[PDB]
Amino acid sequence: QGLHLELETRLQKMYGIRQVIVVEATEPDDEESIKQAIGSAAAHYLETSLSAQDHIGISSWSSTIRAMVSHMHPGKQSAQEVVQLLGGVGGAFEATLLTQRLATLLNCPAFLLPSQRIVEMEEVKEVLHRFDSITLAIVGIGELELAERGAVGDICLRYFDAQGKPVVVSMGLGKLRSINRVLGLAGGVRKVQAIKGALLGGYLDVLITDVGTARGLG
């Protein structure tokens, strides 16, 4: 870790982002090697930068976040709650289980979005209620390729353009921007335009990414 401190610094200045952490993948041009390096660095970050007062939201459909969780270990309370920030219909179950797994690890409550008033409407509002308490959002960044309209990428299935302007239960982009601390976890040469869009929209406060990606952005 920490082999690219100057690159981190330039990216922080270029994009007006607080923190960039740059990791080296074992296999620098491989998507899976990249996800595992980012996830591992993410696990460590959360081990040293998480507060017991933090209310965590996670983009549970993200495989990079899946990599983070699989790199962390099991005990006293390490957070206030873990809220699932995106839910859809089955995949969906695996995203629910991931959110739960993270709450178990942190020893805290989980707020989940499982997959003619009916109780499951109230379960959804329970999670929606939590969005306003969230203090640390952890999010993956998806690439597109909506496209023809202007979108290059998404956070939580919320799409944005090349400058980060916006173009299923999930947190909105406006709500995301105001969170105390948003951790982005993303790398891959295909994601650069998407990540720059997210950076330019001001959605991220911390980005953890690989060297090649950081150089593409840089």
Q: What is the CATH number of the domain that holds 90?
A: 3.40.50.1360
Domain range for residue 198?
A: 1-218
* Domains contained in the chain, number: 1
> Per residue in 68-90, is it b (16+ CB within 10 Å) or e — as a string?
bbebbeeeeebbbbbbbbbbeee
| Rounded Cα distance, 76 and 171, in Å | 29
| Backbone φ, ψ for residue 198 (5° rounding) | -60, -45
| Rounded Cα distance, 36 and 51, in Å | 24
Q: How was this structure determined?
A: X-ray
Instruction: Give this entry's resolution in angstroms.
Output: 2.1
Reported residue count of the chain is 218
